[PDB]
Structure formats: structure tokens, C-alpha cells
């Protein structure tokens, strides 16, 4: 007596898809047909931050829009001053295979993790005057792919363990675990209020989670292949996702379905990172093409290209004031554009 | 403002201290050769690591042959889905692929061949050479001599395979054992050659998982890999 559950799941899926189809009275492209195009957007490389020895895997901006941490797989976690290009810190990591970065909103801590399955948290504002490991969060059974601070004492991490987790940094314990994904969770994005977050996994699906209740609220299944990047729309009511499809898509939490798709015929490479601009009209996405493409989030027209990297673009981040875009790459340089 | 000048000066001193440390780190990062040890659970890769050393997500082994430093990384508590965390190793000098010449229990050799195919033809691993350790050769020999082996009815093309002229059997090597092991080697070499556009090469070896020569094998293959990379870089 097991086939009955399969039949019920199929019926529930049919019900959900029918409800979504009913709700899709109109498309976003139709309603946005009448707004003025953004026009070609050109950005010059204002800064080029160099000093990492190997491919950069992650970067994160500080809340002040001036300091940014980057992780490279040479085993270093460098904190930069983007205005002056001066290095503020250079933290050597125990495991060289870091693949994620985080900057505490307060600026007091940074985090990182990777193939060691551990999220290490570093105290920057030490009384000793030197950076030291504040805490090592252990408990994931697969590589750490993303992490984001909620406060100085809470952090949400995703893993190839196929699960996401919330931690109490003081106690070092896993407050809650978010399960339901089928493949490796690759990216992660906190809402502006940090009450919800969204994750994309290697199962072509994205899920919306409740940080405190600890369950999946909605699941979005537009993509065809592994999701590599996910970002929240500044409003918090939508989020964009990128995948090996060579496509980015926009989902709305309230409509519970895809809104718009960002693809081109000559783009046949996966998307490694996505980000929005301050207003949310520009969607910036990094590609395996070594290029980053700017998309009009409402028209789906490619409004520009951030060419200039000579290898895979792995990370991409817009400052909290929207003043600049940082782009890391496998060529081991970070570039800042305006 | 004097305070602004003082802060700028302090930032510059901190930056130059950081870069003075980074240069010292770079000098050692460029002198080390990173290796990815890959294989299966039933393959004797763990025994090979044990020899080289005389909840963790990744294990690191440090060894040096002559004065060259080698940093070999073994994958620990990682799920069996490798398509994402294997992109991290696109800049190692070589991948050491350990295979057991087999003879639950299934045909492990075909899945080893498929894994080698995926590694060889992956987009990010098209520049990485593979040092192929055809391991557990004594077991293969003893099982082939007993007349109960995997090859005959799992690889029907074996029934019409003849040992190459380039084969170099050991003095006490039974002809059938050498035929079987060279067939297994050619199975991997077909995949290696079908897409070897000159950016990477495969180095097959017959190993027994307890050998003092495995270190030398890796050393010589890495020397060959980097020599060919340099020859290509300079148009020969």
C-alpha cells in the first residue's frame, strides 16, 4: 500500500499547477510592454583588486558599501577597501577549498566554508588587534556552498548535504535544519527583513523557508537544470535564479509562479551568479562565458555586458547603496564597475 | 584634515604589511603541486594514502619527493554526486584516478570507466591530466588464473582482443593475465585518446596498492605533465 501516496502526490501536483495556471491571467511582458526601455548601459572598471593567487569563489559587500570580503581557493580570505584598493585584512584559512563568503551586517565578523563541511567565523574587532577564528560550526555532512549572517549571533548556511541550517554562533549548535531539497543546495538569499530566505539546489527547484518556524512555504520549479545562484528582489516579494540552463528566471512569492525568463539564443552557458540593482530594474548575472550580462528586469532585454574578465565569473555583488558592482572571477581578480 | 592623513597613512602601512605577508605566501604557493586523489570505496586508494603518509569533508596529505612539495587532497564526507564539488579541482597538476580490476557486488569496472569518461570530458577538467592507477593487480592475476573472472562475459569484445606488441609482461607473467590487464588498460585508453586534443594526457599504471614506487610514479607523471604544458606554452 504505497502507490496510493504516489497517486495523491500526483493529484496535489495537478491541483497546484492548475491553480497557478488559473492565476496566470496576464504575463509581466504584456504589462511592461508600454514602459520605456532602459537603454544601453555601459560600465567601466573603476577598480581592479588583485592579490588573490587562485580562482576567486565568493565575495560579499559590507553594509557600509565600502568594505568587501573575498574568498579565493588559495586559502585566503582578504578584506578590501574598495575606495582605495587597500587590503584591510588577509585571513589564512585552515582549508584551502573555501567556496563561500559572508560579511556580518555589523561588520564585526566574516564567515566562510567549503569542502571541509565547516562554517568558520572570524572575529574582526578583536581586542588583541588580530583576526582569529571565533567559532567553527560543524554538523553539515556535505560541502558548504553558501552562508549569510542574520545577526552577529545567527547564520544560515546551505550545503551539499542537501539541507540548510540555522546556527546559534554562541552555542555553536544547529538551531534548526531546513530539509526538503533533493540535490545539493547551491545558493541562498535572505529576505530584507531576514524573516524568510530562499535557496536553490541541484534539482532545478527553489524553495522558500521560514527562518523561525523551519519549514518550506513554497517551491518553485521553472528551471530545467541545476540552480547555481539566487537573489532576492529588493522589495522582498520576488527573487531571481540562475542555472546551467543558461537562463535566469524571476519568481513572485505571492503569485507562486514564474514571472519572466532572461535568456538568449547565443547564450548556451550556465549562470554562476545573479544580483539586482538598488531599484531592482537591473538584473546582473555572471556567466561561464567569462562575461557578466545586465538584464532589464522588466523588459527581459539584455541592457549591457560587463566584459573584461578572462575566466569564469564566479561571484557578483551590488553595494547596499547601489553605487557599484563587484565581480570576481576564476582569473583571480575582482573588478568594480560603475 | 590631519586625522584623515593619519588614517590614510595607517591604512597604507597595514596594506604594505599585508602584501609583505602575501608575497611570502605566494613564494610557497607556487612551489607546491596540488593533487586530487579520486577513486571508489572498494578501490585501494585509502591503502595508497596510508603508504604515502609514512566527519571531515576533505583529507589533506603532504609529502615531498626530492625537494618538490606535493599536496594531495582526498575527498572525505562528500555525497556521491560529484558534478559540483569537482569543479574546485580544475587547476591541480593531475588527478590520481584509482581503479580496482574487479573480478553489494556489481561490475565496478564499467562504472569506473563511466566515471573516468565524465572526468575526462568535463568542461572544467579538459586541461587536467589523469594519473590512472589500475590497482589490485595481484587479485586480478589470481582470479584470472582460477578461470573465474569478470572480463569474459561482461566485456564481450575481450574474446577477440589480443595482447599488444608494446606489452611488457613480467618474467613470471601468465599470458592470459597480461592479456586481461592490457585489455582493461586499453578500455581506459580508448576514452583517453578519443578526446585527447593535446591539452591533457592519461598515464596508466599497474599498481598493487602497497608499492614504494607509487610516489615515484606520481612524481614522474607530474614532471611529464608540466614539461608538456611548458612545451605547449612555448610552441614546442
Amino acid at each position, epitope marked *: 500500500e504505497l502507490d496510493q501516496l*504516489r497517486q495523491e502526490a500526483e493529484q496535489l*501536483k495537478n491541483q497546484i499547477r492548475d491553480a497557478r495556471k488559473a492565476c496566470a491571467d496576464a504575463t509581466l511582458s504584456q504589462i511592461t510592454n508600454n514602459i520605456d526601455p532602459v537603454g544601453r548601459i555601459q560600465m567601466r572598471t573603476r577598480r581592479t583588486l588583485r592579490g588573490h593567487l587562485a580562482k576567486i569563489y565568493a565575495m560579499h559587500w559590507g553594509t557600509d558599501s565600502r568594505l568587501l570580503v573575498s574568498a579565493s581557493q588559495d586559502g585566503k580570505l582578504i578584506i578590501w577597501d574598495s575606495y582605495t584598493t587597500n587590503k584591510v585584512h588577509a585571513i589564512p584559512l585552515r582549508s584551502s577549498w573555501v567556496m563561500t563568503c559572508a560579511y556580518a551586517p555589523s561588520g564585526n565578523y566574516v564567515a566562510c566554508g567549503g569542502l571541509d563541511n565547516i562554517c568558520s567565523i572570524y572575529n574582526l574587532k578583536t581586542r588583541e588587534g588580530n583576526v582569529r577564528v571565533s567559532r567553527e560550526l560543524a554538523g553539515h555532512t556535505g560541502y558548504l556552498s553558501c552562508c549569510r549572517f542574520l545577526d552577529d549571533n545567527q547564520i544560515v548556511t546551505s550545503s551539499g548535504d542537501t539541507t540548510c541550517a540555522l546556527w546559534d554562533i554562541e552555542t555553536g549548535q544547529q538551531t534548526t535544519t531546513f530539509t526538503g531539497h*533533493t*540535490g545539493d543546495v547551491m545558493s541562498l538569499s535572505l529576505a530584507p527583513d531576514t524573516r524568510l530566505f530562499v535557496s536553490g539546489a*541541484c*534539482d*532545478a*527547484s527553489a524553495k522558500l523557508w521560514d527562518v523561525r518556524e523551519g519549514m518550506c512555504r513554497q517551491t518553485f*520549479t521553472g528551471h*530545467e*537544470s*541545476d540552480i547555481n545562484a539566487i537573489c532576492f528582489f529588493p522589495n522582498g516579494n520576488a527573487f531571481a535564479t540562475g542555472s*546551467d*540552463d*543558461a537562463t535566469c528566471r524571476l519568481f513572485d512569492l505571492r503569485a507562486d509562479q514564474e514571472l519572466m525568463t532572461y535568456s538568449h539564443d547565443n547564450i*548556451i552557458c*550556465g549562470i554562476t551568479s545573479v544580483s539586482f540593482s538598488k531599484s531592482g530594474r537591473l538584473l546582473l548575472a555572471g556567466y561561464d562565458d567569462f562575461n557578466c550580462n545586465v538584464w532589464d528586469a522588466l523588459k527581459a532585454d539584455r541592457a549591457g555586458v560587463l566584459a573584461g574578465h578572462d575566466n569564469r565569473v564566479s561571484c557578483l555583488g551590488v553595494t547596499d547603496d547601489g553605487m557599484a558592482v563587484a565581480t570576481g572571477s576564476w582569473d583571480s581578480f575582482l573588478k568594480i564597475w560603475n | 584634515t590631519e586625522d584623515q592623513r593619519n588614517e590614510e597613512k595607517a591604512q597604507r602601512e597595514a596594506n604594505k604589511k599585508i602584501e609583505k605577508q602575501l608575497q611570502k605566501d605566494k613564494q610557497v604557493y607556487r612551489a607546491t603541486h596540488r593533487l586530487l586523489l579520486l577513486g571508489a570505496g572498494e578501490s585501494g586508494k585509502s591503502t595508497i594514502v596510508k603508504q604515502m603518509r609514512i566527519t571531515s569533508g576533505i583529507f589533506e596529505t603532504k609529502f615531498q619527493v626530492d625537494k618538490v612539495n606535493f599536496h594531495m587532497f582526498d575527498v572525505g564526507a562528500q*555525497r*556521491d*554526486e*560529484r*558534478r559540483k564539488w*569537482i569543479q574546485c579541482f580544475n587547476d591541480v597538476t593531475a588527478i590520481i584516478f584509482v581503479v580496482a580490476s574487479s573480478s*553489494n*557486488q*556489481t*561490475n565496478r569496472l*564499467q*562504472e569506473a570507466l*563511466n566515471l573516468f*569518461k*565524465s*572526468i*575526462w*570530458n*568535463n*568542461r572544467w577538467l579538459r586541461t587536467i591530466s589523469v594519473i590512472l592507477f589500475l590497482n589490485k593487480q595481484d587479485l586480478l592475476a589470481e582470479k584470472v588464473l582460477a578461470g573465474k573472472s569478470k572480463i569474459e*562475459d*561482461y*566485456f*564481450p*569484445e575481450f574474446a577477440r582482443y589480443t595482447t599488444p606488441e608494446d606489452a611488457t609482461p613480467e618474467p613470471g607473467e601468465d599470458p592470459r593475465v597480461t592479456r586481461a590487464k592490457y585489455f582493461i588498460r586499453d578500455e581506459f585508453l580508448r576514452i583517453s585518446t578519443a*578526446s585527447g586534443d593535446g591539452r591533457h594526457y592519461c598515464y596508466p599504471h599497474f599498481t598493487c596498492s602497497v608499492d614504494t614506487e607509487n610516489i615515484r610514479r606520481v612524481f614522474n607523471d607530474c614532471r611529464d605533465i608540466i614539461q608538456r604544458m611548458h612545451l605547449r606554452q612555448y610552441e614546442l
Partner: nanobody, 127 residues
Framework: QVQLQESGGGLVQPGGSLRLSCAAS????????MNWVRQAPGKGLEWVSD????????SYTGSVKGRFTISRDNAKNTLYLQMNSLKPEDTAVYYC?????????????????????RGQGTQVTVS
């Protein structure tokens, strides 16, 4: 949503014939390499055969070549596996596995214990 459902199976006498079919949906079928994998009772997932995007390249596991024939027809987004001269040892659940990514020549995790882009599976039994 990426979805695959296999068809065909049931009881077959030894030396008999059977044609398995898979109905693919949720992705551009023509852009992906496809595989056939099977999990016999008490054993792990095995790879049987694969067919490239256009059908130009085909390979089989050595134990079924000469018996099984893999074919894809991109127009109807269906993958077939003609399998005749079945032997008792061919008893297993057969799943259809998709390539992880399009435009790609490697297939990494099709035989893994849990794979997102795999079908539910159809039982094939030989008396």
C-alpha cells in the same frame, strides 16, 4: 518541472522481447544526452546504455550489447530501449536518466543513489 515516466515492463519469458519507453517533459529533450540505468534486486544502480543529443553516438554496457537497442525520437520527446533475447539476469527496475546539463558531453551523477533527473522506474521480470 523536469519529469520522466517510464513505460513497459511486466513478465517476459526467457529469450523474449520488450520495448521500454520514457515520456520526457519539462525540458528541451533534444538538448540532453540520455541514459538507461537499472537496479536489480539487492544490487546497486547500473548503467545500461546512453544516446547523445542527436543519436549519432551510442554505447552499451558490455553485458547487453547485441541484445538491447537504445533509440531516441526528439520530435515526440520520447526515449525507447528495445531489449530482446532477455535473460533471467535482466530482472531489474529500469530508470531513464537525463544528463545534468545541456550541450554537455559528460554525464556525472546518473547512477547516484539519489538523482533529481531520473524517472520513477519500471519493473522488468524474466520467468
Amino acid at each position: 518541472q523536469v519529469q520522466l515516466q517510464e513505460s513497459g515492463g511486466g513478465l517476459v519469458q526467457p529469450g523474449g522481447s520488450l520495448r521500454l519507453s520514457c515520456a520526457a517533459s519539462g525540458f528541451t529533450f533534444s538538448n540532453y544526452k540520455m541514459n538507461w540505468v537499472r537496479q536489480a534486486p539487492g544490487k546497486g544502480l547500473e548503467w545500461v546504455s546512453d544516446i547523445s543529443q542527436s543519436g549519432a553516438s551510442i554505447s552499451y554496457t558490455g553485458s547487453v550489447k547485441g541484445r538491447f537497442t537504445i533509440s531516441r525520437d526528439n520530435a515526440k520527446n520520447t526515449l525507447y530501449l528495445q531489449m530482446n533475447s532477455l535473460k533471467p539476469e535482466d530482472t531489474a527496475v529500469y530508470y531513464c536518466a537525463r544528463c545534468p546539463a545541456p550541450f554537455t558531453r559528460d554525464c556525472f551523477d546518473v547512477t547516484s543513489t539519489t538523482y533529481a533527473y531520473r524517472g520513477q522506474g519500471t519493473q522488468v521480470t524474466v520467468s
